[PDB]
Amino acid sequence: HWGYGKHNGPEHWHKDFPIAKGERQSPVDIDTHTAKYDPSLKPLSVSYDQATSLRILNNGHAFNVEFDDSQDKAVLKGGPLDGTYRLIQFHFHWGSLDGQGSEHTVDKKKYAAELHLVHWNTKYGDFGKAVQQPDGLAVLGIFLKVGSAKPGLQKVVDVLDSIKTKGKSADFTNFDPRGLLPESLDYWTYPGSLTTPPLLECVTWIVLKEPISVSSEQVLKFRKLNFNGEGEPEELMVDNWRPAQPLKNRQIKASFK
Numbered sequence: 001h002w003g004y005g006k007h008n009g010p011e012h013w014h015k016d017f018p019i020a021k022g023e024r025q026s027p028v029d030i031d032t033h034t035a036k037y038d039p040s041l042k043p044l045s046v047s048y049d050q051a052t053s054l055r056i057l058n059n060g061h062a063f064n065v066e067f068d069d070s071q072d073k074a075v076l077k078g079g080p081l082d083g084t085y086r087l088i089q090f091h092f093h094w095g096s097l098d099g100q101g102s103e104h105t106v107d108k109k110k111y112a113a114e115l116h117l118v119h120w121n122t123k124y125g126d127f128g129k130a131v132q133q134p135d136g137l138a139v140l141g142i143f144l145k146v147g148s149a150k151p152g153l154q155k156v157v158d159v160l161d162s163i164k165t166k167g168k169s170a171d172f173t174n175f176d177p178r179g180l181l182p183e184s185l186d187y188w189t190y191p192g193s194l195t196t197p198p199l200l201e202c203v204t205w206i207v208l209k210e211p212i213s214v215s216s217e218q219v220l221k222f223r224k225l226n227f228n229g230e231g232e233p234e235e236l237m238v239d240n241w242r243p244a245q246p247l248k249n250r251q252i253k254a255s256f257k
Ligand SMILES: CCC(=O)Nc1nnc(S(N)(=O)=O)s1
Pocket: 088, 089, 116, 118, 127, 139, 193, 194, 195, 196
């Protein structure tokens, strides 16, 4: 089964998921000098006030904070998007060291981690149908650098001990994802894919320019999670990031001058 190891990592995924070599794969390097400002791009509308988190899950590749997506409670609109995209979950990708961990890179710079807030286009009814459509998902990507702690992340950090191993979940209600955003909503946007198998080419990527700061202690706690299940030899959940893929026939657009 696929993962991030020597023998099942990103360079192997194409054998089971041939779209791994497709025309709109993610992540990509964001060449900031080649991205074109698009004055027609609109401000992102992030409406998370009524978000309903439910549960946090170690799935053996990351941890997901899941939300009730049965109503328009936490929605992303505007920007490059047409219509309404409902938040279903967020998760992160991180490194074994502070110098790597992000999936997208910025002028080849790797951040310590990257947060993905995953939304599906409500015109397709459910996430499973949305992933079959070129405009099915909108993923909001937020870079993490190591410095001052992010107070809004701490509630996530402190539950990780209870979901150390693959398959473990914990009740995780009343989490406000607004506490994970940076001050600015300036962004780059491009058409891409899921960055994990099945790598479906269904994502409008919206990657925020301003990283959030998290503390070394916060990210160290990410690195104490396990890829393995309970009762298996410990494999630290680190370096669960896919590297940058060829941009091919795509333009990255910037919301800001
Ligand atoms: C609801 C299920 C889900 O969100 N699956 C995803 N698989 N890869 C994602 S990524 N790293 O592109 O945001 S999201």
